[PDB]
Amino acid sequence: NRTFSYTLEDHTKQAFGIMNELRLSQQLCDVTLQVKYQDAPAAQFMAHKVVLASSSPVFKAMFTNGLREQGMEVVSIEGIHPKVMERLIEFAYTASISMGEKCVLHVMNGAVMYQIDSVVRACADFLVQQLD
Amino acid sequence: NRTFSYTLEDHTKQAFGIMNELRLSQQLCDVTLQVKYQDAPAAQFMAHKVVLASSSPVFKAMFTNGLREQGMEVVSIEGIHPKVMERLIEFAYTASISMGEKCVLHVMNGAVMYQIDSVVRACADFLVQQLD
Numbered sequence: 001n002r003t004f005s006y007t008l009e010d011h012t013k014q015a016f017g018i019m020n021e022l023r024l025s026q027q028l029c030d031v032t033l034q035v036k037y038q039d040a041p042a043a044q045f046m047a048h049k050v051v052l053a054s055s056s057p058v059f060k061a062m063f064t065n066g067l068r069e070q071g072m073e074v075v076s077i078e079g080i081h082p083k084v085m086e087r088l089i090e091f092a093y094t095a096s097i098s099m100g101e102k103c104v105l106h107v108m109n110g111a112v113m114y115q116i117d118s119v120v121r122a123c124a125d126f127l128v129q130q131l132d
Numbered sequence: 133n134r135t136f137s138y139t140l141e142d143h144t145k146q147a148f149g150i151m152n153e154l155r156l157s158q159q160l161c162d163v164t165l166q167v168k169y170q171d172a173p174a175a176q177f178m179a180h181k182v183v184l185a186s187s188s189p190v191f192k193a194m195f196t197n198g199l200r201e202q203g204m205e206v207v208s209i210e211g212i213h214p215k216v217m218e219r220l221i222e223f224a225y226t227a228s229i230s231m232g233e234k235c236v237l238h239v240m241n242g243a244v245m246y247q248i249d250s251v252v253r254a255c256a257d258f259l260v261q262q263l264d
């Protein structure tokens with residue numbers, strides 16, 4: 001006689017916590033980012049293409065390429081330092097990003113490169129506050 | 133001289149919206165649930181193992197099986213009606229579930245089967261309210 005409709009607000013926060021745990025456990029991962037910047041030593045980041053796609057229109061375009069790979073893809077990344085890539089992956093998984101004030105510019109450059117619009121705004125607003 | 137730390141509250145809600153769009157687009161999917169219940173016609177649900185794993189300890193256990201499949205897995209499901217499975221998948225992707233009051237019991241049974249604790253609580257509390 002009625003339509004019972006439930007909603008849990010905390011769900012998306014809760015699921016992303018499990019998603020991040022799975023990432024750190026290197027479980028259910030389907031992409032390895034291979035980050036090589038200048039003289040910096042090479043770094044690998046394991047991740048889920050969906051989670052990266054859900055936070056970045058650049059990763060979404062990269063991974064939604066009509067037909068699907070049979071499992072693990074290595075994506076060669078250049079132009080971002082491994083430490084920057086690390087922070088942007090962590091943002092995608094946690095909704096949080098952290099950096100020292102001297103590298104807000106370099107995190108912004110990475111966020112522009114991966115079209116992570118919210119952290120571009122955050123970084124540009126922070127840099128503008130550091131002015132008279 | 134300082135630690136700049138940004139956080140976007142809306143991110144997890146925003147990403148799940150993209151995740152659900154990708155599901156309906158049948159993009160980046162790595163599992164097909166093949167649901168056969170009693171006399172009901174067979175149904176297929178495309179999904180992302182991570183998203184199902186992040187919302188269900190039963191799917192998490194199912195998919196975190198030490199070693200990974202090369203792409204698309206078909207999972208044969210029995211004991212839940214396709215309409216129940218549909219609602220529980222949609223919950224995992226949207227944080228929302230909807231049913232008519234006569235089938236709160238059958239949705240609960242599905243949610244117990246997949247250990248989706250929040251909707252078990254919702255359903256059990258609703259059934260208990262329908263009493264004197």
Ligand SMILES: *[C@H]1C(C#N)=C(O)C(C)(C)[C@@H]2CC[C@]3(C)C(=CC(=O)[C@@H]4[C@@H]5CC(C)(C)CC[C@]5(C(=O)O)CC[C@]43C)[C@@]12C
Nearest residue numbers: 037038039040081083084087098099100101102103106107
């Ligand atoms: C600066 C910093 C602080 N405080 C950080 O929190 C992170 C985000 C971890 C930065 C990572 C990138 C890195 C290593 C960096 C500082 C830094 O000086 C280098 C450096 C900057 C210049 C010289 C402009 C280009 C090269 C280089 C590098 O060393 O390769 C790029 C990366 C960057 C910005 C932080 C440690």
Ligand SMILES: *[C@H]1C(C#N)=C(O)C(C)(C)[C@@H]2CC[C@]3(C)C(=CC(=O)[C@@H]4[C@@H]5CC(C)(C)CC[C@]5(C(=O)O)CC[C@]43C)[C@@]12C
Nearest residue numbers: 169170171172213215216219230231232233234235238239
């Ligand atoms: C009842 C309903 C309402 N109102 C719903 O919103 C959903 C959740 C869509 C239900 C899906 C499952 C289904 C088809 C159902 C009603 C119903 O009577 C059947 C039926 C119940 C019994 C007879 C107890 C067992 C068999 C059966 C079936 O038809 O296979 C199981 C599924 C169920 C509960 C809703 C339409």
